[PDB]
Amino acid sequence: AEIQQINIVGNHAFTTDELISHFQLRDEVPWWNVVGDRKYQKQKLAGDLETLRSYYLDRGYARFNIDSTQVSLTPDKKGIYVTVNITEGDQYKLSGVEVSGNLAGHSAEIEQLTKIEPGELYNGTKVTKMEDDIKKLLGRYGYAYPRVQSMPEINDADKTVKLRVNVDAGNRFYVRKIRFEGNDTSKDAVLRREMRQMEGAWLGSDLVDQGKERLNRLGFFETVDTDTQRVPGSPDQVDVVYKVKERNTGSFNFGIGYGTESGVSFQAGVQQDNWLGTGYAVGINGTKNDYQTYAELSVTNPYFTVDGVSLGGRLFYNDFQADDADLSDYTNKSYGTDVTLGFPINEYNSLRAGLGYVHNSLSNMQPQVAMWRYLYSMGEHPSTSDQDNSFKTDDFTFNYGWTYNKLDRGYFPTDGSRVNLTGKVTIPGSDNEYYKVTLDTATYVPIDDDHKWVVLGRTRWGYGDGLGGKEMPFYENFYAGGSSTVRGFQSNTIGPKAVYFPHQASNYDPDYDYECATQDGAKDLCKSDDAVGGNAMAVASLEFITPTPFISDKYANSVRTSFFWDMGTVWDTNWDSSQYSGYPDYSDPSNIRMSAGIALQWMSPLGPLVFSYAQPFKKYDGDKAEQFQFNIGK
């Protein structure tokens, strides 16, 4: 059967169709689009009846009552007729409120919280909101189970209504025990250190909610929920229980292979934010090719003290050889130590202050214009006519940072914003004299009340410059392109492109291609597509997070699908367009690269997997596209 007609009789203030438009039960379904069905059922009729009651109550009709409702069906049992008899009554305006009862000394707050504009129309939804907000106010002071009722008294002579509300706060409840359930791997202290409600203290509903939201922002759990059931037999004692379930945070992968493009490869990667349930953030990246020997260990203890002070330490080593046997080609050794200290200054703000040392060893660099600008900034004058050169620097950096984190949730936020500023400056005595600032923002604005439709605005900013006449080193250059930046482009390719001097190329073999090899007869310097990045960067993106159109409820919480639009550019502020006129101007930031496409993020058992497909609808010469991209982590 199906709904044949929804009819309202006795209504005069509003159109019958307008009254029906709020009902879940649909009188008619349009032919040009699908928005529902007319399948009648008893349960949603009560909800629509309550909705109709609320719609009449929030327009001053305090005397509203439903006389009766008649569900009827055709003799052939295919059609359903629903009719409701309505007595609207007169329209009334709220003439004032009166508060009485045991207010427990909170009268100055209750009377102000229940204050109204005189002569305003009566609103049942406002009455219910007031009833709940009084409960919230009393619960913030430990009165977790108050007794509050409000009855409207109606004057049929004056056409006004008075709300006499009775309030009894009851006993102030104390919490004796806080329990955690489902933390199979996470240490109890990890959950307990996010608390703001203390055991053996009077209850705070705001404190419990803040503890719940901090556990949500921690990111190690999901579907965090609370209950505050009373201890049996006691006038005022409660047990506050936090129920969580644990996900496999992070990922670990390794790979060994032979005879590939990189030769014999051994690449591994570790990333856990909740290492063994201890709360430590541990990352162990590394690879061993014929061309690179890399290892990076980063361990952070977010609660080095009980107050939340963090103590991070990053140790890394990078060694790149552009050729295996001859050892005369490009070589880049990079190793250093980075220890950082972070502490919170507010409920949502934290500051970082650390020291960083890095050693870079360069030899046989292939001539490039911006690189040579950097070398002349450092005071060295190697020869530009050949690839015989070397440069070596030890740098000490004061690393500082500030993070604002009011996100709704740790992994897939639906409300709030995160801002993460990171900065560095060289301590005097270092070889390089430079500074760097990086700002990352991510703001989530939910479109629907269920937070299924969220719009996300991500902006990523970067700037670096030299401090004492010397320039910012090119190993600190920004890069764009890939999953972590503007999508749809080849990874780390967006930005300035290298311009190569005509030079004697090392280990030259005639059957390969070289950018300005003098063996090829290169009279003048080459324009190329080889990306070197730039000292400045500005990347922005707007994403529309949408529900997955085919997923089930049990998998919906781990799959995120979104349409996106990326904006970004990387440029070299110190580039000189006057000296190099015919070559492209890399000092211009106006070459913003754009792309739009679909992204799918998945909390897989193999770790967070992100699948993306983007079309670079704005693209410039000397750049290449990669539409389909994927990431192994986050």
């Binding site: 496999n248 670990f252 790979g255 060994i256 292979g257 005879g259 590939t260 193999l606």
Partner: peptide
Amino acid sequence: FGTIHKRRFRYWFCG
């Protein structure tokens, strides 16, 4: 999850 390609072995760890 593990994958062996032509003389190339990969692995991912769950749990």
